[PDB]
Design a protein around this motif. Structure first.
Motif, PDB file in Angstrom:
ATOM      1  N   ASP B 252     -48.203 -13.017  10.627  1.00  0.00           N
ATOM      2  CA  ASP B 252     -47.178 -13.194  11.710  1.00  0.00           C
ATOM      3  C   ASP B 252     -45.945 -13.457  10.945  1.00  0.00           C
ATOM      4  OD1 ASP B 252     -48.977 -12.343  13.505  1.00  0.00           O
ATOM      5  OD2 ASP B 252     -49.152 -14.444  14.260  1.00  0.00           O
ATOM      6  N   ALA B 253     -45.666 -14.151   9.782  1.00  0.00           N
ATOM      7  CA  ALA B 253     -44.725 -14.528   8.900  1.00  0.00           C
ATOM      8  C   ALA B 253     -44.077 -13.488   8.461  1.00  0.00           C
ATOM      9  CB  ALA B 253     -45.021 -15.557   7.982  1.00  0.00           C
ATOM     10  N   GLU B 254     -45.004 -12.748   7.730  1.00  0.00           N
ATOM     11  CA  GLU B 254     -44.588 -11.465   7.115  1.00  0.00           C
ATOM     12  C   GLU B 254     -43.849 -10.551   8.028  1.00  0.00           C
ATOM     13  OE1 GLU B 254     -47.889  -9.626   5.394  1.00  0.00           O
ATOM     14  OE2 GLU B 254     -47.709 -11.095   3.517  1.00  0.00           O
ATOM     15  N   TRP B 255     -44.335 -10.295   9.428  1.00  0.00           N
ATOM     16  CA  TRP B 255     -43.818  -9.725  10.643  1.00  0.00           C
ATOM     17  C   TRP B 255     -42.677 -10.381  10.862  1.00  0.00           C
ATOM     18  CZ3 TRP B 255     -48.903  -8.402  13.872  1.00  0.00           C
ATOM     19  CH2 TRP B 255     -49.515  -7.345  13.030  1.00  0.00           C
ATOM     20  N   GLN B 256     -42.662 -11.591  11.132  1.00  0.00           N
ATOM     21  CA  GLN B 256     -41.489 -12.405  11.779  1.00  0.00           C
ATOM     22  C   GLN B 256     -40.455 -12.098  10.901  1.00  0.00           C
ATOM     23  OE1 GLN B 256     -41.199 -13.928  14.826  1.00  0.00           O
ATOM     24  NE2 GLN B 256     -39.100 -13.739  14.218  1.00  0.00           N
ATOM     25  N   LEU B 257     -40.565 -12.125   9.342  1.00  0.00           N
ATOM     26  CA  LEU B 257     -39.271 -12.171   8.411  1.00  0.00           C
ATOM     27  C   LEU B 257     -38.704 -10.667   8.626  1.00  0.00           C
ATOM     28  CD1 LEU B 257     -37.874 -13.055   5.935  1.00  0.00           C
ATOM     29  CD2 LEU B 257     -39.666 -11.982   4.605  1.00  0.00           C
ATOM     30  N   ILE B 258     -39.756  -9.611   8.875  1.00  0.00           N
ATOM     31  CA  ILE B 258     -39.209  -8.418   9.103  1.00  0.00           C
ATOM     32  C   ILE B 258     -38.530  -7.905  10.384  1.00  0.00           C
ATOM     33  CG2 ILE B 258     -39.526  -5.775   8.803  1.00  0.00           C
ATOM     34  CD1 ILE B 258     -39.616  -7.380   6.162  1.00  0.00           C
ATOM     35  N   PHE B 259     -39.343  -8.517  11.498  1.00  0.00           N
ATOM     36  CA  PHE B 259     -38.800  -8.333  12.753  1.00  0.00           C
ATOM     37  C   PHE B 259     -37.626  -9.058  13.053  1.00  0.00           C
ATOM     38  CE2 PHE B 259     -39.227  -9.413  17.274  1.00  0.00           C
ATOM     39  CZ  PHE B 259     -39.328  -8.101  17.849  1.00  0.00           C
ATOM     40  N   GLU B 260     -37.550 -10.149  12.669  1.00  0.00           N
ATOM     41  CA  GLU B 260     -36.105 -10.833  12.766  1.00  0.00           C
ATOM     42  C   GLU B 260     -34.914 -10.196  12.184  1.00  0.00           C
ATOM     43  OE1 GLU B 260     -36.152 -14.950  11.747  1.00  0.00           O
ATOM     44  OE2 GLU B 260     -34.202 -15.331  12.269  1.00  0.00           O
ATOM     45  N   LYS B 261     -35.127  -9.605  11.122  1.00  0.00           N
ATOM     46  CA  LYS B 261     -34.054  -8.912  10.383  1.00  0.00           C
ATOM     47  C   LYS B 261     -34.042  -7.509  11.340  1.00  0.00           C
ATOM     48  CE  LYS B 261     -34.975 -10.770   5.793  1.00  0.00           C
ATOM     49  NZ  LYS B 261     -35.381 -10.427   4.381  1.00  0.00           N
ATOM     50  N   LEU B 262     -34.897  -6.792  11.468  1.00  0.00           N
ATOM     51  CA  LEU B 262     -34.854  -5.673  12.740  1.00  0.00           C
ATOM     52  C   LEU B 262     -34.015  -6.101  13.893  1.00  0.00           C
ATOM     53  CD1 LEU B 262     -38.405  -4.283  12.278  1.00  0.00           C
ATOM     54  CD2 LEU B 262     -36.377  -3.574  11.167  1.00  0.00           C
ATOM     55  N   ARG B 263     -33.970  -7.301  14.443  1.00  0.00           N
ATOM     56  CA  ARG B 263     -33.278  -7.600  15.601  1.00  0.00           C
ATOM     57  C   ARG B 263     -31.848  -7.784  15.039  1.00  0.00           C
ATOM     58  NH1 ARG B 263     -35.827 -12.198  18.909  1.00  0.00           N
ATOM     59  NH2 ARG B 263     -34.241 -11.756  20.049  1.00  0.00           N
ATOM     60  N   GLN B 264     -31.549  -8.285  13.851  1.00  0.00           N
ATOM     61  CA  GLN B 264     -30.114  -8.413  13.373  1.00  0.00           C
ATOM     62  C   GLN B 264     -29.396  -7.167  13.092  1.00  0.00           C
ATOM     63  OE1 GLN B 264     -30.993 -10.814   9.818  1.00  0.00           O
ATOM     64  NE2 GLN B 264     -30.825 -12.753  11.240  1.00  0.00           N
ATOM     65  N   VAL B 265     -30.224  -6.186  13.010  1.00  0.00           N
ATOM     66  CA  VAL B 265     -29.545  -4.542  12.918  1.00  0.00           C
ATOM     67  C   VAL B 265     -28.870  -4.377  14.015  1.00  0.00           C
ATOM     68  CG1 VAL B 265     -29.890  -2.351  12.111  1.00  0.00           C
ATOM     69  CG2 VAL B 265     -31.124  -4.218  10.731  1.00  0.00           C
ATOM     70  N   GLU B 266     -29.919  -4.555  15.138  1.00  0.00           N
ATOM     71  CA  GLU B 266     -29.450  -4.200  16.445  1.00  0.00           C
ATOM     72  C   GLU B 266     -28.432  -5.146  17.069  1.00  0.00           C
ATOM     73  OE1 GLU B 266     -33.071  -3.615  18.740  1.00  0.00           O
ATOM     74  OE2 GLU B 266     -33.413  -1.550  17.794  1.00  0.00           O
ATOM     75  N   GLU B 267     -28.420  -6.344  16.895  1.00  0.00           N
ATOM     76  CA  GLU B 267     -27.664  -7.148  17.356  1.00  0.00           C
ATOM     77  C   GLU B 267     -26.119  -7.063  16.809  1.00  0.00           C
ATOM     78  OE1 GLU B 267     -28.322  -9.475  19.340  1.00  0.00           O
ATOM     79  OE2 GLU B 267     -26.604 -10.935  19.436  1.00  0.00           O
ATOM     80  N   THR B 268     -25.881  -6.213  15.679  1.00  0.00           N
ATOM     81  CA  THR B 268     -24.337  -6.441  15.374  1.00  0.00           C
ATOM     82  C   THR B 268     -23.733  -5.032  16.201  1.00  0.00           C
ATOM     83  OG1 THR B 268     -25.069  -6.671  13.083  1.00  0.00           O
ATOM     84  CG2 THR B 268     -22.927  -5.256  13.487  1.00  0.00           C
TER      85      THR B 268
END
Lengths: 48, 507, 525, 528
Positions: B252-268
Motif C-alpha cells: 500500500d505504501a508503494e501504491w500510496q507513494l505513486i497514487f498520491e503523486k498521480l493525484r497531484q498531476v491531475e490536481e494542477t
C-alpha cells in the motif's frame, strides 16, 4: 601489341579486328565481315 | 619527404576536389556517398558532404577542419572554398618545380585577398531605401540557394512556404538558436506545412491512444521530469519489518507513494503535461480518465525549446510549482500524419522560431532544407549590420578576377605570375558550371573578359536562357558578405598545406 | 666506428628535419601519434615530445629542449641545430684522431669563453618596467620566430590582457612576480584575426542556468569561491537506507526535500552573485537560486578553479557553510555574450578596478593554425618574463647577426691556443656557420651570394666610428634578398641575452653526453 | 587479352614518358652532366646523348617507343644537340592532360598545333640569320664555339674550335650532279690515351691505325705517287673437297703446290709497284717472309670496313681474289690509284699511315689524344655529332641564336597569333606557347639559377624589338648568359645554332605529340 611484340597504331577497322583477341564465339565471325569489306570495297574502312 | 610529400598532400585533396566538382551551382549534379550510419547522402551543397566524407590520407583533414569553421559561418556554397583552395594547390605544381618557396606563394595570395576584401565593398552597393527589403529582398536571396539544389520545378510553392517562415524573424533580437526544426517522414514530396512551435512525434503506443483528444482551445503547459511507473526507490528500499500486516502496508505504501503523486498531476489541471522520461502503462488508465494531453520519451533538446518558448521550467516536486511555471498558448491542435500524431504549440508568449513540417520518405532531402534554413538566418544577420548584396549565379568572383590582373600587372615583377595564377584559379567557379551545364567554357570566359571590363560590372551568367545577362536586374541575387570569410579562409589553409614537407605517422 | 659514429646517423635523421623547421621561412610538419593525436606545427620541440624515443640521444635532446621551454622557449631549434651540427663536425674531428675527452675540452673551454663574449654584443641596456608601450614594441620581433603573418593583431590581444593583470604601481611598488599561468588563451573555431577579443575575467563555454547571466549592470555584488563542491549530502563510506517502518517510506523522499530547503536556502541567504559548484545538483535548486538571482557555475575543471581565485578575489573557503560577510570577493559585472554561435559566459568587467588572471579569446578559421598561435602566446608572455623577474634581459642583435661576430672571436681564440685546441676551436666556429645558412636555406637564396655578405659585416673589421653600421645591420629577406643586407635597427628585430645564455650550456652538455658514449646497452627493450 | 579504355591509357602514357624524360633533362645546356646506365649484363656507357640512351633503355609501356624512334630520326636529320631537341616534345604531353579533361576535341588539340607550327615557320624567318649577318670571321669558328656547348668538352674549346674547322676544309667534293657538299660519316676519328686534347693531330685525308707484322719491314715510305692495293684474299692451307675427300709426298705436294702459287701471287703484286699492300686474314711466317723481300709494306688483321673507305677515297679497285678474263692468276696495273702525299707518322707510342691528296674522293681524318677510354666516351659521340652541324652550317647559312632565344621569341609571336585565330583554338595556342617556354626554364634549373627572372627580362627585350618596327637601337637586344645571369648579345658570346636543326626539331616534335593524342586505348596480347 601482338604476342610477338608488334606495335601497330591505326584506326583501320580491318587492321584492329585482325589482331584483336576475341573470346566470344559469335564475335569472332565479325572479323570475316571486315575481311569482306577489304576485298569488296577496300576503301573508307573507318567509315564502313 | 621533399617536394614529393607536398604533391602527395595535394593529391589527397584532389580526390576531394574532383568529388566536389558537381556540388557547386544550380545545374551541378549530385554525388552518392554511403556512411557508417546506413544513411545514403545525395546532396548538392557540399556543406554536410565534407563532414560525412571518409578521410583516408591524414592531410585531407585540413579541408575538413576549415569546413566546420565556414559551416557555422556561411554554410551555403562553402564547397567552393575547398575547390578554390584545391586549385591553388593544383596550380602550385609548376610552382613547386621552380625555386619559389611556399612563403613567397603565401605573400602572393595574401595581397590578392587583402585587396579582395576592399573590392567586395566596392563591387557591391548599399540597397536599402524603397528598394528590395523584407518580404522582398529575403525572398530573392533565399530563392537562389534553395532552388539551386532540390525541388527544382516546384520551388515556386516550396520556397514560398519557407520564405514566409523566415519572415517571423525580427531585428533587435536575432537569436541564432531559432533555426531548430524537426524531421517528419512520410507524405507527398510537394506537400509541406507551417508550424510556429515545437512538434514532437508520439514514438510510443498505449491503450488510451484513440481516446486522446487532439484539440485544446486554451491548454496549460507543464513540464515535469517525474517518471510514472512502479520501480524501486532511489538508493535503498530495504525496510526492516516485524509485524506481518505491515508487509501489505508496504504494498500500500508503494501504491500510496505513486497514487498520491498521480493525484497531484491531475490536481494542477494543466491541459498539457509533458514527461521528460518514459511513461509506463501503470499511470495510463488512471490519467486517461482526466483527458489531458501527455507525451513521454521526450528528447532533452525539445524540452529545452519549450523552456525557451513559453518560459516554463522542469521541476521534480509538484508542491513547489510556482504560478508562472504554467504556460499558456493561443491554440493546440494535434495533427496526425501517417498514423503518427504530432503536437503543435501555437501562440507562445515569445516565439520567433518556426519549425517547418516536411513530408516524404527520403531522409536526405531535409539535409539541405535544414541547411537552407541555416543559410536563411545568415541572410537575415548579414542584411542588418551591413546592407548590400551582389549578383547571383557565381559570377561575382569573375568581376574581381580581372581587377586583380590589371593591378598586379605592374606590381613588383615575379609577384605578377603568382597573383595571375590566383586570378586563373578564380575561373574554376564558372569552369565547373560550364562543364555541368553542357556549355562552352572557352566562348563564355572569353566574353566575360569584355563583360567584366567594357561590360561594366553587374552582368552575370544566365543559365536559363543559355546567354550572358545581368543577374542584378533579374532580381536573383547572392549574399555578398559570405564571400569575405570564404576567400580569406582558403588562403591560410592552402599556405599551411604547401608548408608541410614531411608527414609523421606513428605505429 | 660502430657506436660513436653510427649514433650520429640516428640524430642526422632528426637534424635534417630541424633545418627546415627553423626560422620564419621554415616548413611545417604533420604528426600522427599512435593513439590518434594529430599535431601540425613548425616547432620540433612538440614533435620530439609525442614521438617514440628509441636512440638514447633522442631523449637527451628533448629533455634539453624541455629545459628551454621552462626558461626561454623561444627558438629552441637554434640550439638543437647547433647541437646537431657538433655531431657533423664530430665526424671531422674523429677522422683527425682527437680523443673524445679533448673534444669535450674544446667545447667546454669555449663555453665559458662564449658566455664572456655575450657581454660585448649587449645592446639596448636600459628597459622600462611598468611601461606597456615600450613592451609592445619589443614583443613584436619575438613573434617572428613563429608565423609572422600578423604581428600587430597578436600584440593588441596581449596589450589588453597585460593591461588588466599589470599591477602598475609606478616607480618602486614592490612589484611581485608576473604569473605566466594567469594569461590563458582559448581556441575558438571561426572568425578572422580581428574578430578576436580579450576577456578580463574567465571565459567559459557552457549553458547558462536559469535563462542568461544578467542583473549585474548595477554592479555592487559579492562573489565567493567555494572549494567544497555542492552535491547530495552523503557520508564518506557507502551507506544503505534502512527504514524501520512503512511510515518512513513516504518521509524518505520528503526528508531529502527538507535538506534541499535547508541547504539551498542557507547558501542563498546572502545573495551571492556567482556560486561555485564543482559537483552536480538537483533540479529543485532553481527554486531558491532563481528567486534571489544567483548565477551558477556548473561542473568546472580542476585547473580553471585555481585561476578563478585571482579573478573574483574571493577567499577559497575550505568548507561549504553559509556565506560569511568577513571573507568575500568583489565582482561587479557578469554577463553572457554570444560570439561563435553559442552563448559564452564571460566574467569580464568594465573598469572600476584591475584584477589579475585575464583571458584571451582566439578566433581563427584554421584550427591547425591556432596551435601555432597558442604556442606563440606561451612564448609571447615568456618574453615579458625575461624583463620581469630578472633585473633585465637587455637585448642582442638577432637574425643570426650575433653568431657572425662570434665566428671572428672564436677564430682569434684558436690562434692563441696551440695543440689539440687548434682543430677543436677552429671547428667550433664552424658550428656557428650553420645558423646563417639555415636562415638562407629556408629562404631559398643561394649560399654563394650569402657567403660574402656574412664575411663583409662582422668578419672584416670594425671602423673607429661610433655605432658602426655592422652592428645595426643584419640578414633579412623582404625585397632586399638580392643585396642580402638589411638594417635590424629600423625593423627592431632583437633577442634577449637569456636566449643564447641558456643555449650555450645546452650545446656543450648535448655534445659532452653524446660524444662520451662508448656503447649503447639495452636489457630487454 | 588485357584491354583498358578511357583516360587511364593516356594518363599512364604521359606519366611514363615524363618519368623517362626528366632523367635526360639534367643534360640540357652547357651546364648539363652525363649519367650512367646499368644494363645488368656487364656493359655500361656514360653519355648525355639521347639517341643511344633511349635505344638502350627498356621501354615499359609500348607508347614510350614513339619517343625512342624520334631520337633515331634526329640522327638521320641532324644528330647533334639531342639534349636540346627530344625534350621539347615531352612537355607537350604534360599540358595535354588538362586539355583532354576539357571539352576540346583531340583533333582540335591537333589542329591547333598544326596551324601553330605552320605559322611558326614565318616566325623563325623574322629572327632568321643570313649567311653573313654577324662578324663571322671564318663563320665556322663562331659555330665551333657553339658545338662545344651541351657537352662537357667546353673546357677544351680553345683547341677543338680549331680542330674541327681546319680538318673539314678539305672534305669538299663534287657529287650529286655538281652539288658542293661535305660527305659526312666519311671522317674517321682516332683515340689515344695520355696527355690532353692539345696533342691531337689533323690529317687532311685518310689515316689508318695499324703497324707492320714483322719488325724487320721498312716502316717509312716517302715521296709522291704512292700506290696502295687492298687485298682481301685469305692466304691459308686450303680445305678439302665436298667430302668425297681423296703416297703422302703427293699428298704433301698439295700444300707445296698451293704455297708455291701463293708465293707467285705475291710476285704479281711486286710487279705492280704499290708501296702499301693490305691483307685481311692472318698468315704464318712463310708468307710473311715473302712480303719482306717484296719491298712493299704489308698489314695483317685488317678490318673489312676500314678497307672499304680506302678504295673509295683513293680510287683503287679492291681485289678480294686474283683473277682475269683468262685462267691466269695475276694483278693488273689498272687496279691501283694515285695520291698526292702518303707518309706514315709515329703518334702516341704507335704509327699510322697518313693518306692525303685523294683524287677520287676527298675526305679528312681527325686523330685525337685524350685521358682514357672512359674520358673519351663522351668526347667520341660529341665530335661525331659536331660534324653534322658544321655540314649544315656551310650547306645552309641560316642559323639562329641559342640559349633560349628562339623559345622566348616565339611566345611573343604566338600572343598576337592566339587572338588572331581565336574561337576554341586560342586556348591551344596559349598552352603551346607556354610549353615552349618550359625548355629555357629547365635550362637554369641545371645551373641552379632563377629562370623566371631572366625570362621576364629577356622577353621584355624581344617585345621592344617587335613592338617597334622602325626601331638607332634604344630597345633591340637578345641573348642569355648562364654564367653571369645577364642579357647580352650572342655576337660577343658566340653562341649560334643552325636554323635547319631547330626547324626539323619542332617539325618532328609535332607528330610526336599527335601520336600519343590519337591513342584511344591500348590492348596487349599475351605471348605464346
Amino acid at each position: 601489341k601482338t604476342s610477338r611484340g608488334e606495335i601497330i597504331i591505326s584506326n583501320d577497322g580491318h587492321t584492329i579486328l585482325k589482331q584483336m583477341a576475341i573470346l566470344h564465339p559469335v564475335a569472332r565471325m565479325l572479323v570475316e565481315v571486315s575481311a569482306a569489306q577489304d576485298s569488296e570495297a577496300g576503301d573508307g574502312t573507318t567509315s564502313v | 619527404q621533399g617536394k614529393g610529400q607536398i604533391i602527395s598532400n595535394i593529391n589527397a585533396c584532389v580526390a576531394v576536389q574532383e568529388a566536389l566538382k558537381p556540388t557547386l551551382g544550380p545545374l551541378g549534379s549530385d554525388i552518392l556517398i554511403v556512411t557508417s550510419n546506413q544513411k545514403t547522402t545525395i546532396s548538392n551543397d557540399g556543406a554536410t558532404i565534407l563532414k560525412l566524407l571518409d578521410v583516408v590520407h591524414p592531410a585531407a583533414k585540413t579541408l575538413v577542419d576549415i569546413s566546420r569553421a565556414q559551416d557555422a559561418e556561411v554554410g551555403d556554397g562553402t564547397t567552393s572554398v575547398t575547390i578554390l583552395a584545391g586549385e591553388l594547390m593544383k596550380e602550385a605544381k609548376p610552382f613547386l618545380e621552380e625555386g619559389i618557396s611556399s612563403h613567397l606563394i603565401m605573400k602572393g595570395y595574401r595581397k590578392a585577398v587583402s585587396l579582395a576584401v576592399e573590392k567586395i565593398n566596392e563591387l557591391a552597393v548599399d540597397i536599402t531605401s524603397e528598394k528590395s527589403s523584407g518580404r522582398e529582398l529575403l525572398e530573392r536571396c533565399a530563392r537562389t540557394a534553395m532552388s539551386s539544389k532540390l525541388i527544382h520545378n516546384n520551388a515556386d510553392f516550396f520556397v514560398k512556404m519557407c520564405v514566409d517562415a523566415v519572415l517571423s524573424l525580427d531585428r533587435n533580437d536575432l537569436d541564432d538558436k531559432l533555426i531548430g526544426i524537426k524531421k517528419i517522414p512520410g507524405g507527398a514530396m510537394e506537400e509541406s506545412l507551417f508550424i510556429n512551435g515545437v512538434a514532437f512525434k508520439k514514438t510510443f503506443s498505449y491503450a488510451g491512444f484513440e481516446q486522446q483528444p487532439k484539440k485544446f482551445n486554451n491548454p496549460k503547459i507543464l513540464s515535469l521530469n517525474v517518471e510514472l511507473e512502479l520501480k524501486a526507490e532511489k538508493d535503498n528500499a530495504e525496510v526492516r519489518v516485524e509485524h506481518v500486516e505491515d508487509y501489505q502496508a508496504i504494498v500500500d505504501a508503494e501504491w500510496q507513494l505513486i497514487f498520491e503523486k498521480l493525484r497531484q498531476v491531475e490536481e494542477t489541471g494543466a491541459n498539457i503535461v509533458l514527461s521528460k522520461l518514459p511513461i509506463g502503462d501503470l499511470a495510463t488508465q488512471f490519467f486517461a480518465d482526466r483527458n489531458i494531453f501527455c507525451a513521454g520519451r521526450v528528447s532533452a533538446d525539445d524540452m529545452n525549446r519549450v523552456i525557451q518558448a513559453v518560459g516554463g521550467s522542469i521541476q521534480s516536486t509538484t508542491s513547489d510549482i510556482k504560478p508562472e511555471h504554467l504556460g499558456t498558448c493561443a491554440l493546440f491542435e494535434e495533427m496526425q500524419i501517417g498514423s503518427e500524431r504530432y503536437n503543435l504549440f501555437q501562440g507562445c508568449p515569445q516565439a520567433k522560431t518556426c519549425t517547418l513540417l516536411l513530408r516524404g520518405g527520403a531522409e536526405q532531402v531535409i539535409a539541405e532544407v535544414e541547411r537552407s534554413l541555416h543559410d536563411a538566418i545568415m541572410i537575415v544577420k548579414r542584411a542588418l549590420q551591413n546592407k548590400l548584396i551582389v549578383a547571383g549565379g557565381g559570377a561575382t568572383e569573375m568581376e574581381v578576377s580581372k581587377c586583380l590582373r590589371d593591378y598586379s600587372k605592374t606590381i613588383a615583377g615575379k609577384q605578377q605570375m603568382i597573383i595571375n595564377a590566383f586570378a586563373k584559379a578564380l575561373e574554376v567557379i564558372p569552369r565547373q558550371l560550364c562543364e555541368n551545364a553542357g556549355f562552352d567554357a572557352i566562348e563564355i570566359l572569353n566574353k566575360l573578359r569584355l563583360a567584366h571590363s567594357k561590360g561594366e560590372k553587374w552582368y552575370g551568367v544566365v543559365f536559363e536562357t543559355e546567354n550572358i545577362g545581368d543577374n542584378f536586374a533579374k532580381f536573383v541575387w547572392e549574399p555578398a558578405l559570405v564571400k569575405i570569410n570564404a576567400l580569406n579562409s582558403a588562403t591560410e589553409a592552402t599556405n599551411l598545406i604547401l608548408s608541410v614537407d614531411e608527414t609523421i605517422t606513428n605505429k | 666506428d660502430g657506436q660513436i659514429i653510427k649514433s650520429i646517423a640516428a640524430i642526422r635523421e632528426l637534424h635534417q628535419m630541424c633545418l627546415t623547421s627553423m626560422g620564419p621561412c621554415g616548413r611545417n610538419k604533420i604528426i600522427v601519434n599512435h593513439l590518434g593525436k594529430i599535431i601540425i606545427t613548425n616547432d620540433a620541440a612538440t614533435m620530439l615530445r609525442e614521438l617514440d624515443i628509441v636512440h638514447p640521444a633522442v631523449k637527451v635532446l628533448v629533455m634539453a629542449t624541455e629545459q628551454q621551454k621552462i626558461d626561454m622557449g623561444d627558438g629552441t631549434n637554434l640550439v638543437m641545430i647547433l647541437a646537431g651540427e657538433l655531431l657533423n663536425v664530430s665526424e671531422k674531428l674523429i677522422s683527425m684522431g682527437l680523443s673524445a675527452v679533448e673534444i669535450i675540452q674544446g667545447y667546454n673551454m669555449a663555453r665559458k669563453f662564449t658566455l664572456k663574449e655575450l657581454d660585448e654584443m649587449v645592446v639596448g641596456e636600459i628597459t622600462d618596467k611598468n611601461d606597456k608601450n615600450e613592451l609592445l614594441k619589443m614583443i613584436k620581433p619575438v613573434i617572428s620566430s613563429k608565423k609572422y603573418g600578423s604581428e600587430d593583431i597578436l600584440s593588441e590581444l596581449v596589450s589588453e590582457a597585460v593591461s588588466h593583470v599589470l599591477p602598475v604601481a609606478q616607480q618602486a611598488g614592490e612589484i611581485p612576480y608576473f604569473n605566466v599561468d594567469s594569461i590563458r588563451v582559448v581556441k575558438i573555431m571561426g572568425g578572422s584575426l580581428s574578430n578576436s577579443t580579450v576577456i578580463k575575467g574567465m571565459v567559459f563555454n557552457r549553458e547558462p542556468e536559469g535563462h542568461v547571466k544578467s542583473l549585474s549592470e548595477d554592479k555592487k555584488h559579492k562573489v565567493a569561491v567555494f572549494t567544497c563542491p555542492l552535491d547530495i549530502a552523503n557520508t564518506e563510506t557507502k551507506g544503505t537506507v534502512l527504514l524501520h517502518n512503512a511510515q518512513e517510506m513516504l518521509d524518505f523522499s520528503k526528508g531529502e526535500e527538507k535538506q534541499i530547503d535547508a541547504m539551498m536556502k542557507e547558501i542563498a541567504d546572502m545573495g551571492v552573485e556567482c556560486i561555485v559548484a564543482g559537483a552536480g545538483v538537483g533540479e529543485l535548486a532553481l527554486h531558491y537560486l532563481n528567486r534571489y538571482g544567483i548565477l551558477v557555475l556548473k561542473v568546472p575543471s580542476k585547473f580553471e578553479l585555481r585561476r578563478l581565485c585571482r579573478v573574483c578575489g574571493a577567499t577559497p573557503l575550505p568548507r561549504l557553510g553559509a556565506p560569511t560577510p568577513e571573507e568575500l570577493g568583489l565582482v561587479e559585472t557578469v554577463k553572457t555574450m554570444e560570439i561563435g554561435g553559442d552563448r559564452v559566459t564571460v566574467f569580464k568587467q568594465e573598469q572600476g578596478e584591475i584584477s589579475r588572471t585575464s583571458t584571451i579569446i582566439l578566433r581563427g578559421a584554421t584550427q591547425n593554425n591556432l596551435d601555432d598561435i597558442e604556442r606563440a602566446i606561451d612564448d609571447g608572455v615568456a618574453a615579458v618574463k625575461g624583463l620581469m623577474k630578472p633585473s633585465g634581459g637587455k637585448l642582442l642583435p638577432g637574425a643570426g647577426a650575433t653568431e657572425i661576430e662570434l665566428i671572428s672571436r672564436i677564430t682569434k681564440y684558436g690562434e692563441r691556443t696551440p695543440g689539440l685546441l687548434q682543430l677543436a676551436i677552429k671547428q667550433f666556429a664552424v658550428a656557428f656557420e650553420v645558423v646563417p645558412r639555415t636562415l638562407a636555406e629556408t629562404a631559398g637564396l643561394d649560399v654563394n651570394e650569402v657567403l660574402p655578405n656574412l664575411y663583409a659585416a662582422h668578419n672584416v673589421t670594425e671602423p673607429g666610428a661610433v655605432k658602426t653600421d655592422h652592428l645595426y645591420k643584419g640578414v633579412d629577406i623582404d625585397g632586399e634578398s638580392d643585396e642580402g643586407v638589411k638594417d635590424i635597427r629600423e625593423e627592431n628585430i632583437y633577442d634577449m641575452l637569456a636566449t643564447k645564455k641558456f643555449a650555450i650550456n645546452v650545446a656543450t652538455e648535448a655534445a659532452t653526453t653524446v660524444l662520451s658514449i662508448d656503447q649503447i646497452i639495452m636489457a630487454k627493450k | 587479352g588485357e584491354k583498358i579504355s578511357g583516360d587511364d591509357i593516356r594518363n599512364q602514357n604521359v606519366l611514363a614518358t615524363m618519368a623517362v624524360a626528366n632523367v635526360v633533362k639534367s643534360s640540357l645546356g652547357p651546364v648539363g652532366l652525363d649519367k650512367m646506365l646499368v644494363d645488368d649484363i656487364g656493359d655500361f656507357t656514360v653519355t648525355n646523348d639521347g639517341a643511344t640512351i633511349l635505344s638502350l633503355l627498356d621501354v615499359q609501356h609500348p607508347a614510350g617507343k614513339i619517343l625512342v624512334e624520334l631520337a633515331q630520326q634526329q640522327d638521320r636529320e641532324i644528330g647533334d644537340g639531342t639534349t636540346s631537341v627530344v625534350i621539347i616534345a615531352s612537355e607537350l604531353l604534360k599540358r595535354a592532360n588538362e586539355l583532354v579533361k576539357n571539352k576540346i576535341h583531340p583533333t582540335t588539340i591537333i589542329t591547333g598545333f598544326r596551324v601553330a607550327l605552320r605559322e611558326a615557320i614565318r616566325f623563325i624567318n623574322e629572327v632568321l640569320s643570313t649567311s653573313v649577318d654577324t662578324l663571322g670571321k671564318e663563320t665556322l669558328i663562331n659555330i665551333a664555339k657553339t658545338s662545344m656547348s651541351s657537352k662537357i668538352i667546353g673546357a677544351d674549346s680553345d683547341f677543338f674550335s680549331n680542330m674541327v674547322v681546319d680538318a673539314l676544309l678539305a672534305v669538299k667534293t663534287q657529287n650529286s650532279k655538281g652539288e658542293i657538299k661535305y660527305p659526312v660519316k666519311a671522317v674517321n676519328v682516332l683515340k689515344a690515351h695520355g696527355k690532353s686534347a692539345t696533342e691531337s693531330l689533323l690529317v687532311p685525308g685518310y689515316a689508318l691505325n695499324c703497324t707492320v707484322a714483322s719488325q724487320a719491314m721498312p716502316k717509312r715510305i716517302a715521296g709522291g705517287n704512292v700506290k696502295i692495293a687492298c687485298l682481301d684474299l685469305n692466304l691459308q692451307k686450303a680445305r678439302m673437297a665436298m667430302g668425297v675427300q681423296i703416297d703422302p709426298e703427293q699428298l704433301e705436294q698439295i700444300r707445296k703446290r698451293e704455297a708455291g702459287i701463293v708465293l707467285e701471287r705475291v710476285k704479281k703484286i711486286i710487279d705492280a709497284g704499290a708501296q702499301v699492300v693490305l691483307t685481311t686474314k692472318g698468315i704464318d711466317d712463310l708468307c710473311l717472309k715473302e712480303f719482306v723481300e717484296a719491298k712493299i709494306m704489308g698489314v695483317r688483321r685488317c678490318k673489312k670496313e676500314d678497307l672499304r673507305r680506302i678504295a673509295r677515297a683513293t680510287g683503287a679497285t679492291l681485289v678480294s681474289s686474283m683473277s682475269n678474263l683468262e685462267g691466269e692468276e695475276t694483278f693488273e696495273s689498272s687496279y691501283l690509284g694515285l695520291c698526292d702525299e702518303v707518309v706514315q707518322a709515329k703518334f702516341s707510342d704507335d704509327e699510322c699511315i697518313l693518306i692525303k691528296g685523294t683524287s677520287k674522293h676527298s675526305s679528312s681524318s681527325i686523330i685525337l689524344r685524350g685521358a682514357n677510354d672512359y674520358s673519351l666516351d663522351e668526347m667520341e659521340r660529341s665530335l661525331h655529332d659536331s660534324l653534322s652541324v658544321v655540314k649544315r652550317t656551310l650547306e645552309s647559312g641560316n642559323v639562329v641564336p641559342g640559349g633560349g632565344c628562339v623559345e622566348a621569341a616565339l611566345n611573343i609571336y604566338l600572343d598576337n597569333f592566339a587572338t588572331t585565330v581565336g574561337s576554341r583554338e586560342q586556348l591551344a595556342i596559349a598552352e603551346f606557347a607556354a610549353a615552349l617556354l618550359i625548355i629555357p626554364k629547365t635550362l637554369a634549373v641545371n645551373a641552379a639559377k632563377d629562370s623566371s627572372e631572366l625570362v621576364a627580362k629577356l622577353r621584355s627585350y624581344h617585345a621592344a624589338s617587335q613592338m617597334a618596327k622602325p626601331e638607332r637601337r634604344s630597345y633591340r637586344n637578345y641573348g642569355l648568359d648562364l654564367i653571369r645571369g645577364k642579357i647580352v648579345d650572342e655576337i660577343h658570346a658566340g653562341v649560334l645554332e643552325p636554323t635547319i636543326s631547330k626547324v626539323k626539331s619542332l617539325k618532328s616534335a609535332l607528330e610526336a605529340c599527335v601520336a600519343i593524342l590519337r591513342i584511344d586505348t591500348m590492348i596487349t596480347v599475351d605471348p605464346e
